Amino acid sequence: MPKLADRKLCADQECSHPISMAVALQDYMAPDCRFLTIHRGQVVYVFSKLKGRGRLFWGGSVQGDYYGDLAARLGYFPSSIVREDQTLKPGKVDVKTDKWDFYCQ
């Protein structure tokens, strides 16, 4: 399975800080373990934005039901299914993707 992208944009070198908070406008079911499953209205925190050949996809995690809860797992989803509501930190750190980046969590 080829990497989805060779490079990505993050808020920091380790992609540890979220770039943005977004709300899902469409449902999306993960086609394989690399992807997130999302439903309309759910909140997603975006930690990376892929570049190049993977640029339709962003990486992040789904907010849970209790205040402050964010699932630990990261996965990819199409950027178009969400509306970014708050830019938390500019996503302008241009990083090569590593092998952890497409290994399923």
Author numbering: 3 to 107
According to the publication:
Melanoma inhibitory activity (MIA), an extracellular 11 kDa protein highly expressed and secreted by melanoma cells after their malignant transformation, is known to play a key role in melanoma development, progression, and tumour cell invasion. Structural analysis revealed that MIA is a single domain protein that adopts an Src Homology 3 (SH3) domain-like fold with N- and C-terminal extensions. After its secretion, MIA directly interacts with extracellular matrix molecules, such as laminin, fibronectin, and tenascin; it thereby masks the binding site of cell adhesion receptors, e.g. integrin, to these extracellular matrix components.
Only for fragment 11 (pyrimidin-2-amine) we were able to obtain a complex with MIA in the protein crystals. The electron density unambiguously identifies the binding mode of fragment 11 that sits deeply within the hydrophobic cavity formed by L76, G77, and Y78. The pyrimidine ring is stabilized by the hydrophobic residues L76, G77, and Y78 at the deepest part of the binding cleft. Moreover, the pyrimidine nitrogen atoms N1 and N2 are involved in water-mediated hydrogen bonds with both the side chain of D103 and the main chain of R36, respectively.
